[PDB]
Amino acid sequence: EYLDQAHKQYETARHLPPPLYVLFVQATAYGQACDKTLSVAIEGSVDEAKALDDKRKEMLKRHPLSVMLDLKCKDDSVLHLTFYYLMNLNIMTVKAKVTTAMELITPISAGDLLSPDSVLSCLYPGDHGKKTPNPANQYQFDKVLSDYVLELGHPYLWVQKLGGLHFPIADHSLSASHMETTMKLLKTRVQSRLALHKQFASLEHGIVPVTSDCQYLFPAKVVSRLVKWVTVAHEDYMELHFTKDIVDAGLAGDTNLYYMALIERGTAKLQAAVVLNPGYSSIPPVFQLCLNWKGEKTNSNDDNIRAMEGEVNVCYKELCGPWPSHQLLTNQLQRLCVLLDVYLETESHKEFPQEKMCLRLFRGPSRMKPFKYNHPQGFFSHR
Amino acid sequence: YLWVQKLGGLHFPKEQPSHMETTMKLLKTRVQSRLA
């Protein structure tokens, strides 16, 4: 081999549980079929495999054999998954670990991006990492949890579809397509979180990292700059007065990342509260804006604030670039800086001179300001 | 078949967790059984 181990792995995999054996076989098949950047192994002891708090410990009994698969991505980084099994519950869980080749100097506001409690929380829409899937286990635990979730791992739905468990006996045909779809989703999720890590490391220094590709999306000169980018907490988000509509719409759930950007010009402060759900680059961040310039011009008492929120939130697909579109948040922040420049310069009376070539200042019943940019001629029209 | 690949040297995992002489003797029994 320097100029085999599969037989030893088969002799070890003889003693695996049936969902773990199905996961091992399908993972080896998918690794030999398409993606050679995948490795599986079995960790445990074959001697144990041969075979009222004590009731809680023996109910939450981990199987001594566990499987461990790691992926390498095209960012000299790897993702390690360890699947564990619970024979008393018929539920298999996962622990995760993202490690890069570099030292990975993390910024302050990164935080829960790569924290292994909540990396893979919402691969599919929802699933929360919290609740057990089958209600028979809910009735069994009612006859007798999140700390044990942090101790053992997260019982997702996609993990159990990888194992073959169908919850309304393991099946390879149930594992087949779900294998390739979930491995593609993991490969996108880790790259998205590393790109957000790089962007947050740049955004803490007051600089919006724009690429060479996205330069046609924005005008050349910009005056408004980002001075603060601080992650906040959920309850801190719900304490804000100008974010009632996101909460009442059902978009401010528990499993989100909540940020505060602060953008200024001369005596002009704009607080932008940002919601990310963990399916980034497939579901955009949502923004709320409060301009503390003269009095308090907010979303309820001004319509151009609502127009800027419509330009950022609803029209986000103009800002996504190539197929690995992980640059969406920076494009939204740069567009919102441009919109603050337009809102301050095109306002009729003079602290800010109007240098825009808008050619018409208002239109419509709501007296709308021009917020659409036109690149080959470079001028602002209305939406 | 599975025995063809066991004779060929390839070992594939089954769904639930001296070959040469035995397979050729089973061929010898199968031919005599079908002719009989």
Binding site: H7 | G9, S18
Partner: peptide
């Protein structure tokens, strides 16, 4: 092509030796 045929012959000989070792481990 001659070097590739020699390398393929060496690889087939190594595979035959591994198969003989596997047959010896299965028989014993």
């Amino acid at each position: 092509e001659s070097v590739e045929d020699k390398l393929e012959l060496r690889r087939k000989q190594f595979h035959v030796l591994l198969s003989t070792i596997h047959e010896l481990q299965q028989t014993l």
